[PDB]
């Protein structure tokens, strides 16, 4: 499964690398778990609605969530800072 970062989500991730290493580790942990079970597991995975229909969200922290989408061959990260 290829990992795809939107330009904004990669910037989010870089922000964390230069702000909080434990948040980076949690993001990594969530991505690895998602590779295992796409729609369940760590971070209490929940499907998003309305304008974000088609995406999922896992908890990094209360304020920050990993927003993503899973296709037959890829994990797309839409954002990893704030709720979206
Ligand atoms: Mg953003």
């Amino acid at each position: 499964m290829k990992l795809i970062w939107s330009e904004e989500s990669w910037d989010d991730y870089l922000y964390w690398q230069e702000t909080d290493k434990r948040i980076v580790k949690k993001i990594n942990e969530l991505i690895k778990d998602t590779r295992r079970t796409p729609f369940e597991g760590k971070g209490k995975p929940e499907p998003l609605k309305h304008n974000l229909s088609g995406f999922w969200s896992r908890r990094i922290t209360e304020e920050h969530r990993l927003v993503y989408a899973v296709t037959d061959d890829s994990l797309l990260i839409a954002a990893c800072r704030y709720h979206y």
Side-chain angles (χ1 to χ4, degrees):
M1 185 165 80
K2 59 194 134 307
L3 181 61
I4 309 172
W5 303 80
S6 66
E7 188 154 55
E8 288 174 53
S9 74
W10 183 249
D11 280 339
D12 287 340
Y13 190 63
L14 292 175
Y15 161 82
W16 288 123
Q17 278 181 45
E18 43 199 43
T19 298
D20 200 319
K21 295 298 183 186
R22 64 204 155 177
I23 293 301
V24 173
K25 293 202 70 176
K26 174 57 67 176
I27 288 174
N28 291 351
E29 178 184 17
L30 296 178
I31 287 169
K32 188 178 186 181
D33 193 64
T34 296
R35 290 180 181 283
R36 182 167 183 282
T37 53
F39 315 114
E40 53 188 296
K42 304 179 181 189
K44 181 57 183 177
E46 61 181 51
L48 299 182
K49 307 168 188 177
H50 312 112
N51 50 104
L52 293 181
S53 288
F55 289 89
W56 282 74
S57 176
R58 289 189 188 227
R59 298 168 67 77
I60 295 165
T61 70
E62 172 65 31
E63 180 179 13
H64 307 298
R65 312 299 175 82
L66 178 61
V67 181
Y68 67 97
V70 183
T71 64
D72 62 304
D73 68 327
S74 62
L75 167 53
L76 162 65
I77 309 300
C80 61
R81 189 178 182 182
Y82 305 124
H83 285 202
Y84 50 66

